Amino acid sequence: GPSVFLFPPKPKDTLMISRTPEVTCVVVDVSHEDPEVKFNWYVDGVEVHNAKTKPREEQYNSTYRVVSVLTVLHQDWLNGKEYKCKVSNKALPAPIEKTISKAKGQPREPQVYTDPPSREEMTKNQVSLTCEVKGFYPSDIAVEWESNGQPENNYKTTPPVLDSDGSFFLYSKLTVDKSRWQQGNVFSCSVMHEALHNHYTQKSLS
Amino acid sequence: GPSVFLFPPKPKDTLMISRTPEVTCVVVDVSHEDPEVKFNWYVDGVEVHNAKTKPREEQYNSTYRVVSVLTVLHQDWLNGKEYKCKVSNKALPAPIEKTISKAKGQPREPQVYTDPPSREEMTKNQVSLTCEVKGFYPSDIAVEWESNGQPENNYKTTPPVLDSDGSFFLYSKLTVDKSRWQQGNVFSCSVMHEALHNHYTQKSLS
Ligand SMILES: *[C@@H]1O[C@H](CO[C@@H]2O[C@@H](C)[C@@H](O)[C@@H](O)[C@@H]2O)[C@@H](O[C@@H]2O[C@H](CO)[C@@H](O[C@@H]3O[C@H](CO[C@H]4O[C@H](CO)[C@@H](O)[C@H](O)[C@@H]4O[C@@H]4O[C@H](CO)[C@@H](O)[C@H](O)[C@H]4NC(C)=O)[C@@H](O)[C@H](O[C@H]4O[C@H](CO)[C@@H](O)[C@H](O)[C@@H]4O)[C@@H]3O)[C@H](O)[C@H]2NC(C)=O)[C@H](O)[C@H]1NC(C)=O
Ligand SMILES: *[C@@H]1O[C@H](CO[C@@H]2O[C@@H](C)[C@@H](O)[C@@H](O)[C@@H]2O)[C@@H](O[C@@H]2O[C@H](CO)[C@@H](O[C@@H]3O[C@H](CO[C@H]4O[C@H](CO)[C@@H](O)[C@H](O)[C@@H]4O[C@@H]4O[C@H](CO)[C@@H](O)[C@H](O)[C@H]4NC(C)=O)[C@@H](O)[C@H](O[C@H]4O[C@H](CO)[C@@H](O)[C@H](O)[C@@H]4O)[C@@H]3O)[C@H](O)[C@H]2NC(C)=O)[C@H](O)[C@H]1NC(C)=O
Ligand SMILES: [Zn+2]
Ligand SMILES: [Zn+2]
Ligand SMILES: [Zn+2]
Ligand SMILES: [Zn+2]
Ligand SMILES: [Zn+2]
Ligand SMILES: [Zn+2]
């Protein structure tokens, strides 16, 4: 019969109050004989009624796919509230229930350190600026680079790695030509994480 | 019917001539009515006959599982030879063929840099020694730490990350208490990779 998938908000949407985090409940393999789909949403077991369900959409494999979106409150998600999607369909023996929440566990604030290019690499035409983020929990995190208000997008970040103390770490490598680095330009590593003050911090390098 | 899975050698076994890399051809879901399994092995399409097939082994879901192991030559694997496992069974319409080789692509030698703890972290009771390995291809790689001939095992390494030039990088973080680091002890980052001389290099820190 039908199958339900429940997806969390985009991590960056949970960390910036300016943005609207949403949870998305997707039902696939809805038949033509049983096309009616009913969604019920609960927040910590309390039924809520402000969800937005889109009209069914027929797929190329002859099934219907229907989606329901519930906006979530910034503080609710961060405070660990649980979001239950309940899907009812005539072709089902009983309704399907899916629950989702923010990654659970005691939060731990990242420590952010920047490291300049080593001497050996300062013989190359391009040098690595490194941002070390360690000791954070949970693993949800965003890292960007900037200089003079404008973003520096020639960077790559490792996934979070589980450390031996149960927290996470990662590294972010921004590559700039010596041209800008030897002029003394300030480059900034920006880190977003729930456990930071305002979920934000930045460390500069020069 | 039956299914075949073909697994490569352990990466570290391919980089040390002392060791014996092996490719392993696993056949699952062999029935009781058709228990006979025949393996044929080819190296670049040439049939070879030195493989070691283990006796069938009945599983808890009422099927047989049978495994064939072919030793591979250090230089053959590194030189991109292709290993074909061919499985024949009466319950099959036609034999199943699986081919495997070393990750393909032009090799690129890693650059290894070590970075000492930043000043900010030197206020903590434990400091991070960092080993940056960048510019390597393919992504198969091994990284360890040592000091005075003995291994330093309190470390974590990020997975390889695909860089913007199509090569890979990673970082390895060894955590030691200031006790050993302030005594001036030499810690060594050891990197194994096909494209290094003897597939090995090391960079020390102090
Ligand atoms: C009939 O067709 C249905 C529609 O599929 C589309 O229609 C045609 C055109 C086909 O060509 C399809 O290829 C095409 O995609 C099928 O629906 C799919 O069903 C499967 C299960 O049978 C679902 O698989 C599950 O996918 C989860 C991830 O889904 C995200 O990622 C997909 C890309 O990787 C993407 O297509 C999805 O839309 C969704 O993408 C995210 O959506 C959210 C919310 O909208 C966004 O917030 C994100 O930004 C999106 N991110 C990305 C990267 O797009 C998996 O998580 C899940 O793995 C789970 O199940 C596995 C086992 O399967 C477990 O092991 C695991 O632990 C976990 O529980 C799972 O694979 C798929 O999502 C459905 N696709 C869509 C679009 O809804 C029908 O299956 C098909 N039926 C038949 C009989 O043919
Ligand atoms: C009947 O039972 C068979 C035996 O399974 C065991 O028996 C009983 C006790 C059950 O309780 C089982 O849980 C138990 O495991 C089943 O065989 C299994 O079939 C599935 C497919 O149906 C196979 O899945 C495939 O697994 C690949 C990885 O396999 C490695 O990792 C497994 C753990 O993750 C491990 O169990 C395997 O032994 C193997 O482990 C490696 O072995 C090599 C060589 O020996 C070593 O060199 C490594 O060091 C080992 N590494 C590790 C970590 O152990 C996957 O790669 C593969 O994903 C592939 O297929 C998927 C789709 O499924 C693709 O999407 C993907 O792209 C890729 O192609 C796949 O999942 C599984 O390996 C089989 N298990 C064994 C032990 O052989 C039967 O399936 C089952 N049948 C029925 C009808 O019940
Ligand atoms: Zn229809
Ligand atoms: Zn719950
Ligand atoms: Zn907040
Ligand atoms: Zn039997
Ligand atoms: Zn081939
Ligand atoms: Zn060699």
Dihedral sign, Cα of residue A146, residue A152, residue A155, residue A157: positive
Q: Which of A66, A101, A136 is the last residue of a domain?
A: A101
Q: Which atom of ligand 1 is nearest to the CA of A67?
A: 45
C-alpha span between B61 and A88 (Å, rounded)? 34
DSSP chain B: --EEEEEPPPHHHHH-TTS--EEEEEEEEE-SSS---EEEEEETTEEE---EEPPPEE-TTS-EEEEEEEE--HHHHHTT--EEEEEE-TTSSS-EEEEE-SPPS--BPPEEEEEPPPTGGGGSSEEEEEEEEEEEBSS--EEEEEETTEE---EEEPPPEE-TTS-EEEEEEEEEEHHHHTTT--EEEEEE-TTSGGGEEEEEE-
Q: Do both B155 and B170 map to the same domain?
A: yes
Is residue A94 located within the same domain as residue A131?
Answer: no
**Amino acid present at B123:** T
Q: A131 and A198: one domain?
A: yes
Q: Which residues sit opposite B6 in a β-bridge?
A: B25
* Most ligand 2 atoms within 8 A of CB, residue of B3, B5, B60 to mutate: B5
Tokens describing residue B122: 């030197």
- Please work out whether the CB of residue B60 comes within 6 Å of at least one atom of ligand 2: yes
Distance CA B182, CA B166 (A): 39
Residues 6+ apart with CB under 8 A from A135: A108, A109, A110, A111, A163, A165, A167, A168, A169
Same domain? For A109 and A97 the reply is no
According to DSSP, the β-strands at B150-151 and B142-147 are: antiparallel
| A170 sits in which H/E element | strand A168-177
Q: Are residues B106 and B205 in the same domain?
A: yes
The ligand with the least distance to the CA atom of B62 is 6
Say yes or no: B62 and B92 in one domain.
Answer: yes
Instruction: Judge: B130–A134 Cβ closer than 8 Å, yes or no.
Output: no
* Terminal C-alpha separation, chain B: 59
Cα separation, B126 vs B48, whole angstroms: 54
Mutate to test the pocket of ligand 1, among A57, A58, A61 (most ligand atoms within 8 A of CB): A61
In a mutational test of the A interface, the residue from B122, B161, B164, B177 whose CB has the highest number of chain A CBs within 10 Å is: B161
Q: Is the dihedral of CA B143, B172, B156, B165 positive or negative?
A: negative
Chain-chain contact of A118 with B120 (C-beta, under 8 angstroms): no
Picking from A132, A134, A143, A145 by the largest number of B CB atoms within 10 A of its own CB, the best residue to mutate is A132
Mutate to test the pocket of ligand 1, among A3, A4, A5 (most ligand atoms within 8 A of CB): A5
Instruction: Select from A88, A109, A95 the least CA-distant residue to A168.
Output: A109
One domain, residues A80 and A110:
no
Rounded Cα distance between A115 and B115, Å, is 8
CB B68 within 8 A of CB B54: yes
How many Å separate Cα A104 from the centre of its chain? 14
One domain, residues A112 and A201: yes
B→A contacts (Cβ < 8 Å), by residue, are 111, 113-115, 118, 120-121, 128, 130, 132, 134, 154, 156-159, 161-164, 169-171, 173, 175
What are the tokens at B139? Answer: 């992504």
- Omega prior to A138 cis, within 30 of 0: yes
Please provide the DSSP assignment of A21-41 as one string.
Answer: -EEEEEEEEE-SSS---EEEE
Chains A–B, number of C-beta pairs less than 8 Å apart: 63
Q: Are residues B107 and B206 in the same domain?
A: yes
Residues of A in Cβ contact (< 8 Å) with B157: 161
Indicate whether residue B171 lines ligand 2 (CB < 6 A): no
B88 and B108 housed in the same domain: no
Judgement on whether residues A150 and A139 belong to the same structural domain of the protein: yes
CATH of the domain at B185: 2.60.40.10
Output the CA–CA distances (angstroms, integers) from residue B73 to A180, B13, B79, B81, in the order listed.
48, 10, 10, 10
Largest interatomic CA distance in chain B: 70
Question: What is the residue whose two structure tokens read 């629950």?
Answer: A99
Count other C-beta atoms under 10 Å from residue B122's C-beta: 12
Listed in sequence order, the residues at least 6 apart from A127 whose beta carbon sits closer than 8 Å to its beta carbon are: A117, A121, A175, A176, A178, A181
User: Cis (ω within 30 of 0) for the bond into B138?
Assistant: yes
Q: How many C-alpha atoms does A108 have within 13 Å on its Cβ side?
A: 17
Enumerate residues 6+ apart whose C-beta is below 8 A from A160.
Answer: A136, A139, A141, A168, A169, A170
Measure the CA–CA gap between A143 and A199, rounded to whole angstroms.
12
Query: Ligand 2: does its nearest atom lie under 6 Å from the Cβ of B28?
Result: yes
Distance CA(B201)–CA(B192), nearest Å, equals 7
User: Domain of B168?
Assistant: 102-206
How many angstroms is the resolution?
2.2
Strand partners, B5: B26
Give the H or E element holding residue A198.
none
Structure tokens at B137: 């291809």
B65 within ligand 2 shell (Cβ under 6 A): yes
Q: Are B166 and B137 in contact (CB under 8 A)?
A: yes
Please provide residue B2's backbone torsions phi and psi, each rounded to the nearest 5 degrees.
-65, 160
Considering only CA atoms, which of B168, B186, B176, B185 is closest in space to residue B132? B168
As given in the structure block, the two tokens for residue A64 are 């219907």
Q: Tell me the backbone φ, ψ of residue B190, rounded to 5 degrees.
A: -105, 130
Q: Which residues contact A125 (CB under 8 A, 6 or more apart)?
A: A177, A178
Same domain, B151 and B84: no
Q: Which residues of B9-20 are buried (b: 16+ CB within 10 A; e: fewer)?
A: bebebbbeeeee
Residue of the CA atom closest to atom 40 of ligand 2:
B7
Nearest to A91 by CA among A38, A24, A26, A40: A38
Strand blocks (E) in A36-167: 38-43, 46-48, 52-53, 57-58, 64-71, 83-88, 96-100, 111-115, 126-136, 142-147, 150-151, 155-157, 161-162
Question: To which H or E segment does residue A15 belong?
Answer: helix A11-15
Unique residue bearing structure tokens 């949407």: A13
Out of B53, B84, B101, pick the residue that ends a domain.
B101
Contact A134 B173 (CB under 8 A): yes
Solving technique for this entry? X-ray
Point out the domain boundary residue: A101, A135, A152: A101
The total domain count for chain A is 2
Q: Cβ contact (<8 Å) for B158 and A157?
A: no
Q: Which residues on chain A are in Cβ contact (under 8 Å) with B121?
A: 111, 113
